[PDB]
Amino acid sequence: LTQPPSVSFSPGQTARITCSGDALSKQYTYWYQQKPGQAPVLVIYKDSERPSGIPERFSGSSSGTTVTLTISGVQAEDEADYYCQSADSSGPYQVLFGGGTKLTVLGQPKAAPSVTLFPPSSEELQANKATLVCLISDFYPGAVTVAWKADSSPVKAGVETTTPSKQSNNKYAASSYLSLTPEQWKSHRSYSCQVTHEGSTVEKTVAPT
Amino acid sequence: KVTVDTVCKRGFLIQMSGHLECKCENDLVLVNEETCEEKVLKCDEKTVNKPCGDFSKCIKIDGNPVSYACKCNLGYDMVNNVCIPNECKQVTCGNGKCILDTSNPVKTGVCSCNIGKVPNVQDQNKCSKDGETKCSLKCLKEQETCKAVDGIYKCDCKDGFIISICT
Amino acid sequence: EVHLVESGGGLVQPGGSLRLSCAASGFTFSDHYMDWVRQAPGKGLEWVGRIRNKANSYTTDYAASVKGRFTILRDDSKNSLYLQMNSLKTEDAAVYYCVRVGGLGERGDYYYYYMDVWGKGTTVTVSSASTKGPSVFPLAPSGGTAALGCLVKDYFPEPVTVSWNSGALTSGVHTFPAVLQSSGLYSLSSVVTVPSSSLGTQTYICNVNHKPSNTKVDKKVEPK
């Protein structure tokens, strides 16, 4: 299953979260709301119907292999993470879950992230270790996608990234560390930290000295 | 073949995991795939060719005295006092029923399952595997939506209403 | 009212075993399917497995990531659900939720398969890490401003406290929350935004204190 990692709407707008998958044409799709530090809650079952105890603003629609969760007139009470689920009976029974979507009800102007990338220090390289520190702060909504580039090529392994945490100014901050060997650092021409926030992408680059 | 646009004469459309068919009202029996009529109680001389059960009529037997019995139509045979297709004589599905493969020019029996069950490839395609089946019935009446009742899909009253009509 | 109370979570080393439990109340337990759903810290929901009722021969089904290692058990006479976890990897460390499956009919079989009731969950940690002090490394330095910091690397457990110039420098300091590496050790960074001209005149000392391991490290951050 595939759903966008983050959505953002103003209070009163009609939020929509899409869930795509080939199994969505055979069996039904179910949506779950999960607030921070709380158990998930079923809000929409059988594609479009809602269970007892869910406000009328929650609804859904099915069109082929894509199901859309609809929340008309979003309240700040609705700001949570939403997961879509389904099933696959092709072989053994398998419950399918989506990546999840962070729905942010906007409460302040969208802030672009301030990014700072540090190269491995000379002391750490002398310890046969290399760590690139990419610090991200002062962004709203609290959702971001971090990708590393080794000489303009994607980096898969050796990446450790935190989740956004609420700052004092009600903005969010995150961290992303790229572990390397000193041979990997001194070989490439550059290393980049790409921080995509609300469609816009900020890039920083460091090079050996 | 029966589709979502089929009119069930004196019946109503139901849907299972692999086909649709017409279910009769009250004590009516199927004359064909989409027609329901009253059944006779005893096969008499006057009730010859009148329906006595699902896909069965009363016929005359040219015995030593005249005799009348309830025989299944052509292509059907009697299994558990019910007429089922000849190609379904020895096809057991468990949580479902045997139907004819409409996508095969040769008559072949396949298993259509109750709602919530799908043919299990590891069990001779019987109905022994969990699996949802999306409802495709068009329930356009006033406060009628697709509801799963007794292992099948049917247009029933919306939750909180009862039958003249649903309210 | 329905309640699903998980139990049995805790810290176990990689390769070890652990058994979870779930006490159900407020409904006919023997009628429903029971599922296990886990969720890694800061990641999405992942399905573990499912056990079925007597009407479906108590059969089971799991996800490929936990196949062969996890086993789901139930005791209908005690209204309890269990999860026998074996050969635990660091990827298994997550919060495990006890889940009831709804949508059944009058036959013991289901028409639909959804998850109507969730539990509070129990936390399972998988790491072979013990108490360890951090290794502090310096972070050397348009808009007329620069940034320097201290890298608090590989420590266990939480927390650490980072001060700058013995608490004299507070303005412009941002100590980021720690990251939990796959080894089980924590690592964070603390940077301070300073004017570019003051790099050659003003001294910047970062003071890292790790009370769990009784480690106090002072580091000077100089430009280069």
Side-chain angles (χ1 to χ4, degrees), chain A residues 1-155 157-188 190-209, chain B residues 1-45 47-49 51-59 61-141 143-161 163-167, chain C residues 1-119 121-210 212-224:
Chain A
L1 304 187
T2 294
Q3 47 180 144
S6 57
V7 296
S8 62
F9 295 88
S10 301
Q13 293 185 309
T14 301
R16 288 179 177 86
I17 302 178
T18 48
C19 184
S20 296
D22 271 328
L24 265 35
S25 62
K26 300 295 178 57
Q27 306 193 32
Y28 286 105
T29 305
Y30 307 90
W31 290 93
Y32 297 93
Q33 177 195 71
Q34 184 189 38
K35 296 195 176 188
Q38 303 180 27
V41 169
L42 180 65
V43 296
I44 284 295
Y45 62 8
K46 285 181 286 296
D47 286 356
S48 62
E49 307 179 16
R50 75 178 74 93
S52 302
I54 306 298
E56 297 189 21
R57 62 173 173 269
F58 286 81
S59 57
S61 61
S62 177
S63 66
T65 58
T66 299
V67 178
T68 301
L69 171 63
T70 301
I71 306 177
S72 61
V74 277
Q75 299 181 6
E77 185 190 6
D78 298 328
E79 174 161 346
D81 292 63
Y82 292 87
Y83 300 91
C84 56
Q85 83 124 317
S86 185
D88 172 80
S89 296
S90 177
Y93 191 89
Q94 290 291 325
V95 173
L96 273 52
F97 269 106
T101 299
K102 178 58 183 177
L103 166 62
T104 303
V105 186
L106 300 179
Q108 66 191 81
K110 296 182 179 179
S114 184
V115 187
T116 300
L117 179 60
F118 282 102
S121 55
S122 73
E123 298 188 16
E124 184 189 5
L125 293 178
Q126 292 186 276
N128 199 29
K129 292 172 185 173
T131 296
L132 285 82
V133 179
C134 186
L135 296 184
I136 312 159
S137 58
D138 289 352
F139 60 89
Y140 183 88
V144 99
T145 288
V146 186
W148 290 82
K149 288 290 184 297
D151 234 5
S152 70
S153 298
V155 179
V159 177
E160 228 75 273
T161 303
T162 78
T163 62
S165 60
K166 192 174 181 178
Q167 293 183 180
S168 303
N169 53 9
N170 285 246
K171 295 176 185 175
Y172 288 81
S175 308
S176 188
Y177 304 86
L178 172 61
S179 292
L180 294 176
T181 73
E183 300 81 12
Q184 294 188 248
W185 168 246
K186 297 182 296 181
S187 65
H188 291 262
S190 68
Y191 273 83
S192 298
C193 179
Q194 296 178 352
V195 186
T196 299
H197 166 77
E198 294 290 328
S200 61
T201 300
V202 178
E203 190 181 33
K204 297 293 182 176
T205 306
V206 294
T209 178
Chain B
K1 200 179 73 65
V2 179
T3 63
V4 289
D5 298 1
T6 305
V7 281
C8 300
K9 303 298 296 182
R10 303 200 63 182
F12 54 91
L13 267 176
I14 69 173
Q15 178 192 358
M16 297 185 68
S17 78
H19 77 304
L20 287 76
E21 66 179 31
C22 290
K23 183 179 175 184
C24 296
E25 311 166 345
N26 309 325
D27 298 4
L28 300 181
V29 300
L30 285 166
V31 169
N32 51 71
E33 272 98 334
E34 72 182 48
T35 304
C36 294
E37 295 179 355
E38 271 115 347
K39 59 166 177 55
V40 299
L41 303 180
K42 180 187 180 65
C43 281
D44 287 329
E45 168 188 345
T47 66
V48 175
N49 303 120
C52 40
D54 287 322
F55 302 103
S56 61
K57 325 165 190 173
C58 296
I59 68 171
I61 282 79
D62 282 324
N64 5 292
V66 290
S67 180
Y68 304 93
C70 185
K71 183 188 75 72
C72 304
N73 306 336
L74 279 78
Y76 294 90
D77 207 323
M78 196 85 64
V79 171
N80 296 322
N81 280 11
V82 169
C83 298
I84 62 177
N86 287 333
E87 292 73 20
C88 285
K89 287 180 201 176
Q90 295 159 352
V91 179
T92 54
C93 306
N95 278 320
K97 65 179 300 180
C98 179
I99 64 176
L100 291 182
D101 195 336
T102 54
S103 58
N104 188 12
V106 188
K107 284 189 171 184
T108 306
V110 293
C111 282
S112 188
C113 303
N114 300 330
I115 300 309
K117 298 288 184 175
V118 293
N120 185 12
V121 63
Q122 286 182 310
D123 193 6
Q124 214 160 342
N125 276 336
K126 294 187 188 65
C127 300
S128 54
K129 168 177 291 184
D130 290 357
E132 290 175 348
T133 308
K134 280 189 172 182
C135 184
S136 51
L137 293 177
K138 298 181 179 180
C139 308
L140 311 178
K141 286 189 183 178
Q143 298 200 127
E144 269 200 358
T145 182
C146 183
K147 181 184 295 180
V149 181
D150 282 326
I152 64 183
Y153 273 146
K154 65 181 298 181
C155 293
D156 204 7
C157 302
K158 293 189 177 183
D159 294 322
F161 307 102
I163 55 182
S164 298
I165 61 177
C166 298
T167 192
Chain C
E1 190 178 7
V2 182
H3 289 287
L4 296 177
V5 183
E6 295 84 351
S7 300
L11 170 62
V12 284
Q13 296 203 62
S17 303
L18 185 55
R19 178 121 143 185
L20 301 180
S21 59
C22 174
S25 54
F27 65 100
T28 306
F29 179 79
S30 59
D31 280 354
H32 293 261
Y33 292 3
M34 301 302 302
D35 279 43
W36 283 101
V37 178
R38 66 183 187 178
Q39 188 180 33
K43 298 185 178 182
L45 300 179
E46 185 179 15
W47 181 68
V48 176
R50 164 176 300 180
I51 189 169
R52 296 182 177 85
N53 52 13
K54 181 186 176 183
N56 294 266
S57 306
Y58 299 110
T59 54
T60 59
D61 262 321
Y62 307 85
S65 59
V66 301
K67 171 194 174 183
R69 302 184 298 113
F70 288 7
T71 300
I72 298 184
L73 311 174
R74 73 187 302 172
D75 195 328
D76 287 355
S77 58
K78 300 199 305 177
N79 297 326
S80 301
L81 175 70
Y82 306 99
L83 176 61
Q84 176 68 56
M85 301 180 297
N86 298 320
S87 300
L88 285 177
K89 314 170 186 176
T90 44
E91 298 82 302
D92 299 329
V95 171
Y96 289 71
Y97 288 99
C98 181
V99 178
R100 186 192 78 179
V101 177
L104 51 83
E106 62 282 354
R107 24 165 44 83
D109 300 317
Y110 284 69
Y111 299 115
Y112 323 101
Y113 300 90
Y114 50 87
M115 304 175 178
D116 55 357
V117 179
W118 295 63
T122 180
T123 304
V124 175
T125 311
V126 177
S127 78
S128 55
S130 61
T131 303
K132 160 173 171 50
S135 296
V136 183
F137 292 109
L139 299 174
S142 59
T145 55
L148 62 103
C150 262
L151 176 64
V152 179
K153 180 182 176 182
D154 296 335
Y155 66 91
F156 186 89
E158 283 262 80
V160 294
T161 58
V162 183
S163 64
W164 284 90
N165 294 337
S166 302
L169 173 57
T170 52
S171 180
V173 182
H174 192 176
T175 299
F176 285 75
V179 69
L180 185 52
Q181 296 169 135
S182 59
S183 62
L185 306 176
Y186 291 95
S187 295
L188 53 78
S189 304
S190 176
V191 287
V192 47
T193 298
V194 300
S196 304
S197 62
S198 62
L199 290 181
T201 52
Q202 184 154 77
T203 302
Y204 299 106
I205 311 285
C206 89
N207 326 98
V208 180
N209 182 29
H210 185 234
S213 65
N214 292 121
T215 301
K216 299 177 182 178
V217 179
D218 291 1
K219 265 285 189 183
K220 184 174 183 177
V221 184
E222 280 187 338
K224 212 286 161 295

